[PDB]
Amino acid sequence: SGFRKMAFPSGKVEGCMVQVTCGTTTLNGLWLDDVVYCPRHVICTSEDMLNPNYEDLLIRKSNHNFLVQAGNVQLRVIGHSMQNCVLKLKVDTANPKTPKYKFVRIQPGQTFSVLACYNGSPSGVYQCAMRPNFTIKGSFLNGSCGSVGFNIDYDCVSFCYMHHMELPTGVHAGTDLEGNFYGPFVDRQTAQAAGTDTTITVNVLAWLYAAVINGDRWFLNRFTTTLNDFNLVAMKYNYEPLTQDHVDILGPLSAQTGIAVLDMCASLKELLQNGMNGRTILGSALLEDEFTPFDVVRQCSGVT
Amino acid sequence: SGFRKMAFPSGKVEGCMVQVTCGTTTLNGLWLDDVVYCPRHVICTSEDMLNPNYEDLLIRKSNHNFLVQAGNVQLRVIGHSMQNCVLKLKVDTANPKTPKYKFVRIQPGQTFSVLACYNGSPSGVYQCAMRPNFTIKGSFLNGSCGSVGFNIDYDCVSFCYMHHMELPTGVHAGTDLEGNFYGPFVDRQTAQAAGTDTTITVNVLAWLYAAVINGDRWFLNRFTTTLNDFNLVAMKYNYEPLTQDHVDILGPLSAQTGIAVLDMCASLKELLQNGMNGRTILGSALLEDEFTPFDVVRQCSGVT
Ligand SMILES: *CCC(=O)N(c1ccc(C(C)(C)C)cc1)[C@@H](C(=O)NC)c1cccnc1
Ligand SMILES: *CCC(=O)N(c1ccc(C(C)(C)C)cc1)[C@@H](C(=O)NC)c1cccnc1
């Protein structure tokens, strides 16, 4: 019993973190096999940030200009290339701690763990969700760039995020491991505003199922609804529309609790309309949306 | 910017988790040097749980009755002893991944990370606090016993908790690494009720400082208070009394934000009396108490 915002064990990713320095800029890199991946903005100086031409800035850089340190030992850079917004630094040594891995590009609403690092050293691990506006609400200070987001399936780490920047509103933007930003963001010091941060409806429902499994049942109402009626209310409350695909993925939680997905939607609809009335669900006074249906099943079943 | 419930990187602890089986009971063990630490209730059978006499149950156990598996390889048990509620199984092999470590007994209000494990394999990591009633609100399923709680200071892991059981209310109880339970709990299947789960006042204040540092300032009021006036309100709201020791440890946060500790107490007093009015602080609709002043400083400074 008990339901926590849980991150994946970070050991496999800790074994991949390195420090990357170019000139006077130092950030984090991800060392997998003989390649170190890092944000291309490591090549930017004190003011280049405003309107950088990365191809031009990169012409002035050679392999020896990128300093890669793994632990307290230096790695030899034998090649470098830019792929979208990431630099790939080929080193002469394969990372001996390289886990089985994949690079995946996640969809909004999908959750992942972040290993926040500074100077190639891990400071903490926390669980995030890719927001519907393609930002993440992380905890990142100066020097955290290059910290990565990931999911683990037994022994295979799927890297889905690399931290690049903080928007003027304090929310975060980054890329997949192929260097493509999530959302419309660009790696330059220009004012970039985020769109509406809507609530991930399918994740709230999954978390309401988690609450029922854990004994928190006060919110269960005597009503049902339809997807169309529910979505009219969801739109009004800035919740993402629920599709039949979302209903399908909530099926195992519906089966475990015996609560039809549309009945849980009606309970959620009443929570939106009536508020919590000072009550809490799983120790929260607001509806949590950073647990996917997969996360609820995983945590409630003890997948290792 | 951004403030997250962050756990310590778990790699150093993942390297210590093993599976311990005695008869038909399997739980987790912590392998440090040539000793495997695990809850003594691993020796209890299907019904022994009701009124176990551990000394008597242990007489029927020999070294070969404890099966310790690290990864997919078996460790040889060459000694066993009971220290309070933990068993210490001496093995013939020192754990090659033993980090620098300490065993500490924490006070209520102190936070720590938990690496939840099943069958000696890590499933997730989350941040907890030792509640003022000496329970923890964890996320633990059957087989999670032996999972540990810890803090890290650079390279030294201080182990502070080992999971033993779930109370009938779904809250958790365990011991320090010397086998002494936190609180009055006993390792037996008897109804044991927890005391009042009061709010850790010093931690709420630390988190209100974290919110100011991160731009969440709406709650800052035009008032101040005294420790005695604040505590009259704190007692009324089931908040722990604030001492001058708590004021002293909040000093660095008071200095960074320029907000006197007693002024933050007055803002907290108004939040208690007026409620949040549907507003949020650091994405929460309730006052968070599982961040210590040390955690706020660490996260806001990027300690690795
Ligand atoms: C890792 C660098 C860093 O801390 N940045 C940062 C600075 C500059 C840039 C470019 C404009 C792309 C050259 C990118 C990232 C911080 C930032 O975004 N400042 C505007 C940063 C601070 C806090 C959290 N993440 C990043
Ligand atoms: C790790 C065992 C387990 O899952 N228990 C458990 C069972 C029995 C006992 C004794 C009574 C001391 C012999 C202790 C622990 C669960 C439990 O506490 N059941 C009552 C358990 C379930 C969920 C979370 N933690 C533990």
UniProtKB/Swiss-Prot annotation, chains A, B:
Changing N142A: Does not affect ability to cleave and inactivate human TRMT1. Residues 1-304 form the Peptidase C30 domain. Coiled coil: none annotated. It catalyses: TSAVLQ-|-SGFRK-NH2 and SGVTFQ-|-GKFKK the two peptides corresponding to the two self-cleavage sites of the SARS 3C-like proteinase are the two most reactive peptide substrates. The enzyme exhibits a strong preference for substrates containing Gln at P1 position and Leu at P2 position. Inhibited by pyridone-containing alpha-ketoamides compounds 13a and 13b. In turn, alpha-ketoamide 13b (tert-butyl (1-((S)-1-(((S)-4-(benzylamino)-3,4-dioxo-1-((S)-2-oxopyrrolidin-3-yl)butan-2-yl)amino)-3-cyclopropyl-1-oxopropan-2-yl)-2-oxo-1,2-dihydropyridin-3-yl)carbamate) inhibits SARS-CoV-2 replication in human lung cells. Inhibited ex vivo by michael acceptor inhibitor N3. Inhibited ex vivo by compound 11a and 11b. The active site is at H41 (for 3cl-pro activity), C145 (nucleophile). There is a cross-link at K5, K90 (Glycyl lysine isopeptide (Lys-Gly) (interchain with G-Cter in ubiquitin)). Changing Q189A: Does not affect ability to cleave and inactivate human TRMT1. Residues 1-304 are cytoplasmic. It is found in: Host cytoplasm; Host Golgi apparatus; Host nucleus. Changing L205V: In strain: Zeta/P.2. 3CL-PRO exists as monomer and homodimer. Only the homodimer shows catalytic activity. Interacts with host FBXO22; this interaction promotes the proteasomal degradation of nsp5. Cleaves the C-terminus of replicase polyprotein at 11 sites. Recognizes substrates containing the core sequence [ILMVF]-Q-|-[SGACN]. Cleaves and inactivates human TRMT1, preventing tRNA guanine(26)-dimethylation of tRNAs. May cleave human NLRP1 in lung epithelial cells, thereby activating the NLRP1 inflammasome pathway. May cleave human GSDMD, triggering alternative GSDME-mediated epithelial cell death upon activation of the NLRP1 inflammasome, which may enhance the release interleukins 1B, 6, 16 and 18. Also able to bind an ADP-ribose-1''-phosphate (ADRP). This is 3C-like proteinase nsp5.
